[PDB]
């Protein structure tokens, strides 16, 4: 790196020393070092970069946002100093942009990336990063405009390609997006080996019915992005038994299964009564996972918090679940009624965590046409009986019956999580 300017050049013995007290883990000595040099050598750009770098790490150690803000201003100050090395300038502002992104000053970071591109119009790597600035604030139109400029000069930049495909996919151009995602990943370009882009590729493919997408999930696994080709949840705890379908006995939560099966008509009636007397408390489910049809849910507990307004509506049922904190205390689950109507298709998808099991109590199940697949096994519900699967495995759902299907969904902690784990995990 061209990081010693003439202005700064002639202090290297002193400059280098500050670098040693930092590199030795004595940033406190090191921070205070450079500061004097700012006093002593005020215009040195390298004297001001190091300052920022000291307090940047000083912020890492103290884990302090406020301190880090200090460093962000100081990285900037480098850029004001006159007669600065280009290599050094780039370094300080790139880091500023990133530390700003870290703290969530997304538009502030975008503003810095805008500068960096004015100052290095032939650095396509910075144009790439600018595109990310735009995505991070929601301006996909300008992000699209950026990757098109890159790709017009750099036809084969895979970073630009995978982001370009993301963007297309996000504008509902699913099929156009797939070759971009494939080519950008295949390039192995830096930044393309990202779990996010296998996810969107395989999704897109699944949504255009191309079978080749499991190949890509399987690769994401062998790259470490997915627990397996089927188990693709993000927030995971290692060493939890991973199987798609479970039985009551296998989970140990047999008392819960029994309360549910045995009082099932009561659970049904209180949901059926909400459909009648307050249809509005069923909200539509994920429009993103709903290919077509009518699919709605009525939540009682979300992430171990009882919706108090909802237990007024189905009171005995809430009373029943109070006896079972493996579910009501599942900070990584919900407890909800779910109604699917004819002509509904739920795209393949997985849940966010392997730290819960999903139980489904059948309440109103048409005698034909409702099925659910989890990994390679497809099954159907029975009124009054309970299914259990690990919704961190890809699952998919169809409603091709002639009347409505109502179920009751009940998340439990994954049975192998210990008490201290259940207490400590964030939701
Ligand atoms: O309501 C349903 O049948 C869909 C369930 C589902 O996709 C899920 O439980 O994660």
């Amino acid at each position: 790196p061209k990081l010693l300017n003439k202005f700064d050049k002639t202090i290297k013995a002193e400059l280098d020393a500050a670098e040693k007290l930092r590199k030795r883990g004595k940033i406190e000595e090191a921070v205070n070092a450079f500061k004097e040099l700012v006093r002593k050598y005020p215009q040195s750009p390298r004297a001001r970069y190091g300052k920022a770098q000291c307090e940047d790490d000083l912020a890492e150690k103290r884990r302090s946002n406020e301190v880090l803000r200090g460093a962000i201003e100081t990285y900037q100050e480098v850029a004001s100093l006159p007669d600065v090395p280009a290599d050094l300038l780039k370094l300080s502002l790139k880091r500023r942009s990133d530390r700003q992104q870290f703290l969530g000053h997304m538009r502030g970071s975008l503003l810095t990336l805008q500068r960096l591109v004015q100052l290095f119009p032939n650095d396509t790597s910075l144009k790439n990063d600018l595109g990310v600035g735009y995505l991070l604030i929601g301006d996909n139109d300008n992000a699209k405009k950026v990757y098109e400029e890159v790709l017009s000069v750099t036809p084969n930049d895979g970073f630009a390609k995978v982001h370009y495909g993301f963007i297309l996919k996000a504008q509902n151009k699913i099929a156009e997006s797939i070759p971009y995602l494939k080519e950008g990943i295949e390039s192995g370009d830096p930044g393309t080996d990202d779990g996010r882009f296998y996810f969107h590729l395989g999704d897109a493919m699944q949504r255009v019915g191309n079978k080749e997408a499991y190949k890509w999930y399987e690769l994401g696994h062998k790259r470490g992005h997915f627990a397996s080709v089927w188990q693709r949840s993000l927030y995971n705890v290692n060493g939890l038994k991973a199987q798609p379908w479970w039985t009551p006995k296998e989970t140990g939560y047999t008392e819960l299964v029994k309360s549910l099966e045995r009082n099932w008509k009561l659970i049904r009636d209180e949901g059926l009564a909400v459909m009648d007397k307050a249809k509005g408390l069923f909200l539509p489910e994920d429009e993103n996972l709903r290919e077509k049809g009518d699919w709605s849910q009525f939540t009682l507990w979300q992430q171990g918090r009882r919706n108090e307004n909802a237990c007024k509506g189905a009171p005995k049922t809430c009373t029943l679940l109070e006896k079972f904190p493996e579910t009501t205390g599942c900070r990584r689950g919900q407890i909800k009624y779910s109604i699917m109507h004819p002509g509904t298709h739920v795209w393949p998808h997985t849940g966010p965590t392997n730290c819960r099991l999903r139980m489904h109590l059948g309440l109103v199940i048409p005698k034909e046409g409702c099925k659910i697949r989890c990994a390679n096994e497809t099954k159907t519900w029975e009124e009054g009986k309970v299914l259990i699967f690990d919704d961190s495995f890809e699952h998919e759902v169809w409603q091709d019956a002639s009347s409505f299907r109502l179920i009751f969904i009940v998340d439990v902690w994954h049975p192998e999580l210990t008490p201290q784990q259940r207490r400590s995990l964030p939701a």
Side-chain angles (χ1 to χ4, degrees), residues 1 3 11 13 15 17-18 22 25 28 30 32-35 37-38 42 45-52 54-57 59 64-82 84-93 95-117 119-210 212-214 216-278 280-304 306-311 313-322 324-366 368-399 401-427:
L3 128 143
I11 297 176
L15 291 175
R22 179 175 110 250
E28 297 86 315
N32 296 333
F34 286 105
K35 294 187 172 175
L37 296 179
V38 172
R46 183 50 164 109
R48 207 82 61 88
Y49 176 102
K51 183 173 173 182
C54 287
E55 44 184 347
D56 185 338
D57 298 353
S64 167
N65 290 9
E66 264 59 57
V67 168
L68 183 40
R69 295 175 61 211
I72 293 191
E73 172 58 17
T74 294
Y75 280 131
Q76 178 82 336
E77 297 174 14
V78 170
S80 55
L81 299 181
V84 175
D87 277 354
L88 173 69
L89 176 71
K90 197 179 295 179
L91 268 62
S92 57
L93 289 192
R95 178 65 184 180
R96 183 179 185 248
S97 173
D98 178 23
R99 290 302 81 194
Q100 295 176 284
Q101 286 190 6
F102 176 65
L103 296 164
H105 308 167
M106 297 316 175
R107 207 185 121 85
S109 161
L110 168 63
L111 288 179
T112 298
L113 297 154
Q114 308 205 127
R115 188 172 192 198
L116 276 172
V117 164
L119 291 183
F120 307 80
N122 317 117
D123 183 323
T124 88
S125 197
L126 292 175
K127 289 198 166 47
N128 280 334
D129 287 335
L130 168 75
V132 178
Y134 280 116
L135 289 170
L136 291 192
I137 78 174
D139 189 352
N140 292 23
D141 286 281
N142 272 313
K144 195 171 166 172
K145 277 193 261 186
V146 170
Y147 292 113
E148 289 169 356
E149 304 170 20
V150 161
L151 295 169
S152 77
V153 183
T154 300
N156 278 325
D157 169 64
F159 186 112
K161 284 196 164 167
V162 279
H163 286 82
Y164 195 63
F166 179 83
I167 293 171
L168 291 175
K169 172 155 188 286
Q171 313 181 323
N172 217 38
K173 300 208 185 199
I174 313 284
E176 293 75 337
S177 75
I178 300 179
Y180 284 96
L181 296 172
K182 273 173 185 177
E183 294 167 9
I185 295 176
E186 275 186 7
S187 76
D189 280 5
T192 69
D193 182 41
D194 187 322
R196 315 208 266 122
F197 297 122
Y198 290 86
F199 166 100
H200 283 288
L201 175 44
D203 189 43
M205 299 201 261
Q206 292 182 280
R207 284 171 183 247
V208 304
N210 167 2
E212 188 203 339
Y214 290 110
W216 283 96
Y217 291 133
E218 182 69 50
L219 175 62
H221 170 32
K222 292 177 186 171
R223 300 303 287 156
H225 301 288
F226 304 129
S228 75
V229 56
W230 297 110
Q231 219 195 353
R232 312 191 298 272
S233 54
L234 174 60
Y235 300 103
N236 298 321
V237 171
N238 307 124
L240 298 177
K241 191 182 183 190
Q243 70 183 28
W245 295 98
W246 294 58
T247 64
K249 174 167 186 173
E250 277 173 321
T251 67
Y253 292 135
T254 48
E255 281 320 303
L256 178 49
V257 176
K258 288 173 174 176
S259 268
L260 291 177
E261 294 190 345
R262 296 168 175 171
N263 299 82
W264 84 266
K265 298 193 204 217
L266 164 61
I267 299 170
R268 198 200 40 208
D269 288 351
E270 296 211 307
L272 282 187
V274 169
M275 297 174 40
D276 302 353
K277 295 135 69 163
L281 289 175
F282 279 76
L283 310 176
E285 259 298 1
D286 202 328
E287 283 309 324
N288 177 72
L289 309 169
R290 180 174 65 80
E291 181 191 354
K292 68 188 187 215
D294 209 284
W295 181 30
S296 304
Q297 60 85 358
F298 169 40
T299 295
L300 311 175
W301 265 265
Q302 179 175 325
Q303 294 192 315
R306 174 200 201 181
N307 187 334
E308 202 58 48
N309 211 253
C311 282
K316 313 182 173 312
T317 284
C318 290
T319 292
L320 194 53
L321 310 165
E322 302 287 7
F324 293 105
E326 56 264 39
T327 173
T328 72
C330 191
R331 291 176 178 202
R332 275 187 180 182
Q334 302 112 45
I335 312 178
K336 55 189 172 185
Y337 289 89
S338 182
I339 182 174
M340 203 169 281
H341 294 278
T344 293
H345 172 256
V346 176
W347 289 126
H349 75 278
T350 83
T353 187
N354 76 325
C355 286
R356 70 189 197 201
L357 292 180
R358 193 155 267 194
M359 311 189 171
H360 281 193
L361 172 61
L363 303 184
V364 175
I365 306 321
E368 55 174 54
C370 305
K371 49 172 181 174
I372 169 172
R373 177 181 61 74
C374 183
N376 66 302
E377 281 199 69
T378 304
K379 295 180 172 276
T380 189
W381 303 272
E382 309 186 53
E383 286 182 4
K385 288 324 254 165
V386 158
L387 285 179
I388 317 176
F389 65 108
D390 179 346
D391 88 317
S392 76
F393 288 73
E394 187 196 283
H395 57 278
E396 187 178 5
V397 180
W398 300 265
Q399 220 287 27
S402 303
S403 87
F404 68 100
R405 182 227 73 184
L406 181 61
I407 69 179
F408 186 63
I409 305 170
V410 178
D411 283 325
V412 296
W413 288 116
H414 185 292
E416 291 180 11
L417 289 171
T418 72
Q420 178 56 40
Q421 292 182 287
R422 284 153 201 233
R423 294 194 285 272
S424 51
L425 289 162

